[PDB]
Amino acid sequence: GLGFALAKIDPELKQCKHQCKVQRQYDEQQKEQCVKECEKYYKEKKGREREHEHRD
């Protein structure tokens, strides 16, 4: 299919995913779980969402 597109998402995952990928190296499945938790915050709230944006 046409999965080449980056398909950017909300920035809140930028910082949370970064934290997951920088702290304690994780396998594809292990990193999937951390993203799942970060993504879960976004998913559950499903609102405008706000963050400090200390990093990036």
Automatic annotation (TrEMBL):
It comes from the Eukaryota. The chain holds residues 19 to 70 of 536 of the full protein. It comes from Anacardium occidentale. This is Vicilin-like protein. Disulfide bonds join C16-C38, C20-C34.
